[PDB]
């Protein structure tokens, strides 16, 4: 038993809710919150900008040190950093950005990072301003992640549609 509440169960291991991941994190304080990152860990907008703002920019400060030491992530890759006031850890995961011209097949690789963590609070990767189809992304998530994932979808009409069309 865990502390996540109000989720629709999609499969044995995938759950979904119409909520702001930031508010879910503040309420639950999960072991792992997933950020929808870019390779530079520049948390300017979307989920990343919102999470970073909620940490009072501490996520960005930590991220800049990470990049200065290690260089950029790979598209499809991830790193584990602090969750600051929101979670124990933040798993920064880079899905492909179609608005940048990247290969959507890398979305499966991105979701594979979730399998290194028994339970996660996450957004849909590559959706929103990353330019991919959120229905697709949900399918890849369900078909790739085997650990317990709680998906927060902020856009209300998207949740509705994803709920009702999920095969």
Ligand X SMILES: O=C1CC[C@@H](c2ccccc2)N1Nc1ncnc2[nH]cc(Br)c12
Binding footprint of ligand X on the chain (CB under 6 A): 20-22, 36, 46-47, 50, 123-124, 127-130, 134, 152-155, 158
Residue 67 beta carbon to ligand X: minimum distance, rounded to whole angstroms: 19
Residue 20 beta carbon to ligand X: minimum distance, rounded to whole angstroms: 4
Decide whether 1 or 3 has the Cβ nearer to ligand X: 3
Decide whether 127 or 141 has the Cβ nearer to ligand X: 127
Decide whether 57 or 65 has the Cβ nearer to ligand X: 57
Decide whether 96 or 123 has the Cβ nearer to ligand X: 123
d(C-alpha 143, C-alpha 70), whole Å: 31
DSSP secondary structure string for all residues of the chain: --S--SPEE-SSSEEEEES-HHHHHHHH--SEEEEE--TT----SHHHHHHHHHTTTHHHHHHHHHHHHH-PPPTT-EEEEE-TTT-SEEEEE----GGGT--TTHHHHHHHGGGGSSEEEEPPTT-GGG-S-HHHHHHHHHHH--SEEEEEE--HHHHHHHHHH--
Decide whether 76 or 123 has the Cβ nearer to ligand X: 123
Residue 69 beta carbon to ligand X: minimum distance, rounded to whole angstroms: 25
Residue 103 beta carbon to ligand X: minimum distance, rounded to whole angstroms: 18
Residue 45 beta carbon to ligand X: minimum distance, rounded to whole angstroms: 7
Nearest residue to ligand X, by Cβ distance, number only: 128
């Amino acid at each position: 038993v865990n502390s996540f509440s109000g989720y629709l169960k999609l499969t044995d291991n995938v759950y979904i809710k119409n909520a702001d991941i930031v508010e879910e994190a503040k309420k639950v304080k999960p072991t792992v919150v997933v950020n929808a990152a870019n390779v530079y860990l520049k948390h300017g907008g979307g989920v990343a900008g919102a999470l970073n703002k909620a940490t009072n920019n501490a996520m960005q400060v930590e991220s800049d040190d990470y990049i200065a030491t290690n260089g950029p992530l790979k598209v499809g890759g991830s790193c584990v950093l602090s969750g600051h006031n929101l979670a124990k850890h933040c798993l920064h995961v880079v899905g492909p950005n179609v608005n940048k011209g990247e290969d959507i097949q890398l979305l499966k690789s991105a979701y594979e990072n979730f399998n290194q963590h028994e339970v996660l609070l996450a957004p849909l990767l590559s959706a929103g301003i990353f330019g991919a189809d959120p229905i697709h992304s949900l399918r890849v998530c369900v078909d790739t992640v085997r650990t317990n994932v709680y998906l927060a979808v902020f856009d209300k009409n998207l949740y509705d549609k994803l709920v009702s069309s999920f095969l």
